[PDB]
Design a binder for these strands. Structure first.
Length: 233
RNA sequence: AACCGUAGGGGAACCUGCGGUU
RNA sequence: AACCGUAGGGGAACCUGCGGUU
């Protein structure tokens, strides 16, 4: 019964007069249907399928703009100055869409996704993390919206996915995001090794971080403290 | 930036060892 | 055998360093 669940997602977006809203990763149809019931301005569906895009021939309201490219490698700031990305995220490429969206932090203050409880709990921080989580929480706040049991989907799957809300909250200023990504990949590479091995000790000692500690024991402010030293000062 | 080659990261499909339940 | 847990095997997107070509 997607009826109920799809409404809750639009409700959470808070759509007003001058709102541009981009849907990512369709493949169902009814996603746009329920969104177009809200006071929109411009709506863009990003759908990978060349057959699904042709299903714009449902009602064909001239206030849409379906864009046939892929959501995981798209530049969002090409569209608008303040965007509200929404989308049910497929389990396989879910990571890439989130990485992709944060890159456009400047032109997207709010984003709401249907991911997967494990993928979501990882992103939150509380239950232990990966680099992608740190990348997100650097520029956004992840918020648990609601759980969805394996019945509200087309079939009943093996996972119980959850809805997440991402409100913009840049924690510390960062000039090059790719530079910053490369940094996190360098720290998270080979998780179980001591920090000292991965990064020059002269800088671990600089921060409050014990060099013989592990990358898991770190927490946001730790990641900031030493990055501000990495690109120098 | 794209694309070859190259070195890693990554971590889906599937495969198996052990344990719990039917 | 199936499902959950657990230890690996395996390695799809995709990212990155270096080199070449545009």
């Amino acid at each position: 019964v997607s009826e109920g669940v799809l409404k809750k997602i639009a409700e959470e977006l808070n759509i007003e007069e001058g709102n541009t809203v981009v849907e990512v990763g369709g493949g169902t149809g009814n996603l746009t249907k329920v969104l177009l019931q809200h006071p929109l301005k411009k709506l863009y569906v990003i759908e990978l399928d060349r057959e699904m895009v042709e299903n714009l021939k449902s009602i064909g309201d001239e206030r849409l703009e379906v864009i046939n490219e892929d959501a995981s490698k798209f530049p969002f700031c090409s569209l608008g100055k303040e965007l509200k990305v929404v989308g049910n995220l497929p389990y396989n490429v879910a990571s890439l869409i989130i990485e992709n969206t944060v890159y456009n932090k400047d032109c997207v203050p709010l984003a709401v996704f249907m991911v997967q409880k494990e993928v979501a709990e990882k992103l939150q921080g509380k239950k232990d993390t990966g680099w992608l989580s740190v990348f997100v929480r650097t520029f956004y706040d992840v918020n648990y919206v609601m759980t969805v049991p394996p019945r509200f989907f087309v079939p009943p799957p093996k996972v119980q996915s959850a809805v997440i809300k991402l409100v913009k909250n840049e924690k510390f200023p960062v000039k090059d995001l790719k530079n910053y990504k490369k940094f996190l990949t360098k720290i998270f590479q080979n998780r179980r090794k001591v920090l000292r091995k991965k990064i020059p000790e002269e800088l671990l000692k600089e921060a409050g971080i014990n060099p013989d500690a592990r990358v898991e024991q770190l927490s946001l402010e730790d990641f900031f403290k030493l990055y501000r030293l990495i690109e120098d000062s």
